[PDB]
Amino acid sequence: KTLGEVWKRELNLLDKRQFELYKRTDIVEVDRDTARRHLAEGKVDTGVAVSRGTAKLRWFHERGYVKLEGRVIDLGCGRGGWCYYAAAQKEVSGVKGFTLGRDGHEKPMNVQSLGWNIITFKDKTDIHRLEPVKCDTLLCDIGESSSSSVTEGERTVRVLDTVEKWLACGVDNFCVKVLAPYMPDVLEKLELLQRRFGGTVIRNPLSRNSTHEMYYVSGARSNVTFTVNQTSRLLMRRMRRPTGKVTLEADVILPIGTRSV
């Protein structure tokens, strides 16, 4: 009965053209053309991002929503967009990325942007069964969309349930994807986590309108229900008039090489 649940219901009722236009209406998007061409030809020394994820994490990082420091752990790293971004930051000492990378799941990509040598990728790993390890910065970008709000809720609570085990070890910084922050049980879990570990949820402007995803980050503190609903109101407004109008931005280009000595 939350605004977000209403949004999900109306989203599923849109026709093909409206859905297509809607998902990109008034959003920011990084131009991935050059990056994709470089990766497709096997270039590993141009500093291009391995996925759209690098730009998403940069957005949070550049405005203080999450500090990237010391021992970084990336749960559900996929191709490694967040791992490579973190590895290039001077404040980061090491990065451990874990991902399924099997049965259709994206496997870590091998490129040599700055600090690639301080990253340890581990595939064939279900992070829900992975024993928590002590770290300073915890990252998690897991959450598979579902046309069912109940299902998105279940998936989101499972992610937060697992992440809480890791935060309990004591972490300074975190950035965790919250697939369906609009579900009531999720809102309550977020309020509980905020009281225990601080932080709040933030909507990334690079996220498409077809998902209500927001990220639980350590760098700010705000009223969770209020801000989740602000995003619900924005998503609903954009559904009334979908123009498909997108604003293109330059993708992330990282320096290259190993971090040595």
Ligand SMILES: Nc1ncnc2c1ncn2[C@@H]1O[C@H](CSCC[C@H](N)C(=O)O)[C@@H](O)[C@H]1O
């Ligand atoms: N239970 C699980 N354990 C490990 N990885 C999982 C998982 N569930 C989903 N994943 C992986 O989590 C990834 C989410 S997409 C992550 C993109 C990454 N942030 C980037 O910047 O490139 C997907 O590859 C998905 O396969």
